[PDB]
């Protein structure tokens, strides 16, 4: 009759959430408007007011993506969930996919594609570079894949992948084009429809500054056609484009129960998107690009070496070579302890090789560029001089 | 420079979120303490303060589940993600799973299991009843499965499934037991280890009254052993027990990046779990059971007929037969328009057959029982002759 496990003393303590300047590659600092909204009361997952918020979110993602795709919605999962769903829906066992590897995100997408039963091919960029159009074409011709996967902003290497003409080329060869824009959307140009992109997703917590955990996704008519010609059901009910699309009112069918959406995350995402739409893409993108340029000047004045090829830089995540003799983790710790500012190390192929400074959303301002420049310089100088 | 899609006018309007009394089967009304916590600033997904919150959550779930399992963590997905992940990790192609069907959740689990490539078998409850031990034993003998899946509280039928001795029986037959406790945990006795349950999950938005979208899960040593003997990687990186368990500090390995957890949902869940642990399981379960007893008296005095067998009722979700000549949807609309109180229809097998009144967390009080009884009776009286 005993309860062998007792109520944890730990939970009698107050919840502690220090207010930090998150100048890593994400999450970025939430606008106060988005934090306030997440105190709103919970709504039922199928209540008209919830569906209204979802509808408004769809219009906002269509703007941000520049698409008219009817199959536009959000996944109830973090950014990886976008990668998962896009692969899960558009691959069957033995389908050949080509991954355009420009950093860690090439490794992660290859992993998921293999877990889903695909025949995974990879074309690797030169170090610190994007893939050229020629390199992409050559690999397409060689592999003859049904899917090509590219990461527009690879946050591990700070590399922005060019996309003009690639969807067109894919479509000459019965190939679908999937693009990750988690780190890049709002910090670099994107025109989903104009660039013939078939499936695309972004993150809530990067340029948008919404909470992590809900991810906008869109599928073209060609991608929907692919889904319709599947011989077997997608492996995960949770990601099934038809079923979540129906919940999100995409295909003219009744709304029905698929899962309970997090109305909290809807509130924060909706306000974040409203803010971004009000600023407008041209101003939003320009602000991130201009901030990044200011960062480069300060870093290069101070004698630091940037990792990415200057032609290939992503505004939102700047990779900086760790100077000979500095302990990057100790530098990070110094910055956090003294200032409550986050500076980050690398990821995947750049683990231990770089620092990464994110300039995203609330943090892409001249004041915050200057702050991160100051504390980064101080932290590096502080450690083994 | 050409933006064919324009900033949506809809997002210029205020976000609107009416505060309703959610007396359907979930989500339930959030404590003010949980809503307040969700305005806290976002933290980095690997920051020590974040890992501390996750650690504290693990202690709380171990308490609520009554388990010492090291493989205890939360999934960054809604309740369906618990079912997905538990099936995904514990099934390989051709594995025989037996589903104990006591309502909708038997159909949904059978669905996911077939999607994941399992050889799916079903044993079905008598209408409005739980499965007996003999019925389970007989089915085990016929199918000889490697996993049995049961739903402790099936929210579609309002049925509580008895679990004493079933894990033991499963283990006598080289079978793992998976149990869904989304609707039942906190509203009915549960002792995961004592009852020899191998995998279990709950929902954040039911008894706990946290936001939807993060789901506590736990796996026994036997379950972990099953995982370790797979010859194939789990199909979804996002659900992989080993990888999310490592992010959650479960297996003695370094914490690494798996995905960006949602700060906001952590805070809400942390607070909800803290509150439940402070009340304690004995008082928490008793409160739900007593509130349900009060509701049954009120309903039966008013001449309504309960759907579930008196011996098999789930405290947290009460199924009520829709009287002859009542439009259930119309009655629900009436209650929502006049009082902002939610009463729900049916789900899956009970769709169009029942009303469902949830008594969960903040809404399991004598006052709220009396409120829903008053509005339910008024709403039904309004649409009937």
Curated annotation (Swiss-Prot), chains A, B:
Pfam short name (any one): Aminotran_5
Residues with PTM N6-(pyridoxal phosphate)lysine = 206
Reactions performed catalytically: glyoxylate + L-alanine = glycine + pyruvate
Query: Which residues of the sequence carry a binding annotation for glyoxylate?
Result: 155, 356
Q: Which UniProt keywords apply?
A: Aminotransferase, Peroxisome, Pyridoxal phosphate, Transferase
Gene3D superfamilies assigned to the protein according to its UniProt record, in alphabetical order: Aspartate Aminotransferase, domain 1 (3.90.1150.10), Type I PLP-dependent aspartate aminotransferase-like (Major domain) (3.40.640.10)
Keyword Transferase listed? The answer is yes
Describe the pH profile of activity.
Optimum pH is 9. Active between pH 7-10 (for alanine and glyoxylate as substrates).
Q: List cofactor names only.
A: pyridoxal 5'-phosphate
> Which Gene Ontology terms of cellular component type are present?
peroxisome
As one GO molecular function, the record gives: alanine-glyoxylate transaminase activity
Q: What is its EC number?
A: 2.6.1.44
* Binding-site positions, L-alanine: 155
What is stated on temperature in the biophysicochemical properties of this record? Optimum temperature is 60 degrees Celsius. Maximum activity between 50 and 80 degrees Celsius (for alanine and glyoxylate as substrates).
Q: Does the keyword Transferase belong to this entry?
A: yes
Kindly state the tissue distribution recorded for this protein.
Expressed in head and abdomen of adult females.
Which compartments does it reside in? Peroxisome
Q: Name one GO biological process term.
A: glycine biosynthetic process, by transamination of glyoxylate
* Cited SUPFAM superfamilies: PLP-dependent transferases
Q: Residues that bind pyridoxal 5'-phosphate, according to the entry? A: 78-80, 205, 257, 260
Quaternary context:
Homodimer.
Known role? Catalyzes the pyridoxal 5'-phosphate-dependent transamination of alanine with glyoxylate as an amino group acceptor. Can also catalyze, although with much less efficiency, the transamination of serine, and histidine with glyoxylate and the and transamination of glycine with pyruvate as an amino group acceptor. Does not catalyze the transamination of both 3-hydroxykynurenine and L-kynurenine. May play a role in the detoxification of glyoxylate, a toxic plant metabolite from the pupae and adult diet.
Family label: Belongs to the class-V pyridoxal-phosphate-dependent aminotransferase family.
The name on file for this protein is Alanine--glyoxylate aminotransferase
Q: What is the organism of origin for this protein?
A: Aedes aegypti (Yellowfever mosquito)
Query: Gene symbol?
Result: AGT
């Amino acid at each position: 009759m005993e309860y062998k496990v007792t109520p944890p003393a730990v939970l009698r303590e107050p919840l502690v959430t220090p207010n930090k300047l998150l100048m890593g590659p994400g999450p970025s600092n939430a606008p106060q408007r988005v934090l306030d909204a997440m105190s709103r009361p919970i709504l039922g997952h199928l209540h008209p007011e919830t569906l209204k918020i979802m509808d408004d979110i769809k219009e906002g993602v269509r703007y941000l993506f520049q698409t008219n795709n009817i199959a536009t919605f959000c996944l109830s999962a973090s950014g990886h969930g976008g990668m998962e769903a896009t692969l899960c829906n558009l691959l069957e066992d033995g389908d050949v996919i080509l991954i355009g590897h420009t950093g860690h995100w090439g490794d992660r997408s290859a992993d998921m594609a293999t877990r889903y039963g695909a025949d995974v091919r990879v074309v690797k960029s030169k170090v610190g570079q994007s893939l050229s159009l020629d390199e992409i074409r050559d690999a397409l011709l060689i592999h003859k894949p049904s899917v090509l996967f590219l990461t527009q902003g690879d946050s591990s290497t700070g590399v922005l992948q060019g996309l003009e003409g690639v969807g067109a080329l894919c479509h000459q060869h019965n190939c679908l084009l999937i693009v990750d824009t988690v780190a890049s959307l709002g910090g670099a140009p994107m025109f989903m429809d104009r660039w013939e992109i078939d499936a695309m997703y972004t993150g809530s917590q990067k340029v948008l500054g919404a909470p992590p955990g809900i991810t906008p996704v869109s599928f073209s008519h060609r991608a929907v056609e692919r889904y319709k010609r599947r011989n077997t059901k997608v492996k995960v009910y949770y990601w099934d484009m038809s079923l979540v699309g129906d919940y999100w009112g995409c295909f003219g069918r009744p709304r029905i129960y698929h899962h309970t959406i997090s109305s909290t995350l809807l509130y924060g995402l909706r306000e974040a998107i409203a803010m971004a739409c009000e600023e407008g893409l041209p101003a939003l993108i320009a602000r991130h690009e201009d901030c990044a340029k200011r960062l480069y000047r300060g870093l290069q004045d101070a004698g630091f070496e940037l990792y990415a090829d200057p032609k290939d830089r992503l505004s939102t995540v700047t990779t900086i070579k760790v100077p000979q003799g500095v302990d990057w983790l100790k530098a990070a710790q110094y910055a956090m302890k003294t200032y409550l500012v986050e500076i980050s190390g690398g990821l995947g192929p750049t683990a231990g090789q770089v620092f990464r400074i994110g300039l995203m959303g609330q943090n892409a301002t001249t004041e915050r560029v200057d702050r991160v420049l100051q504390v980064f310089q101080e932290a590096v100088a502080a450690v083994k001089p």
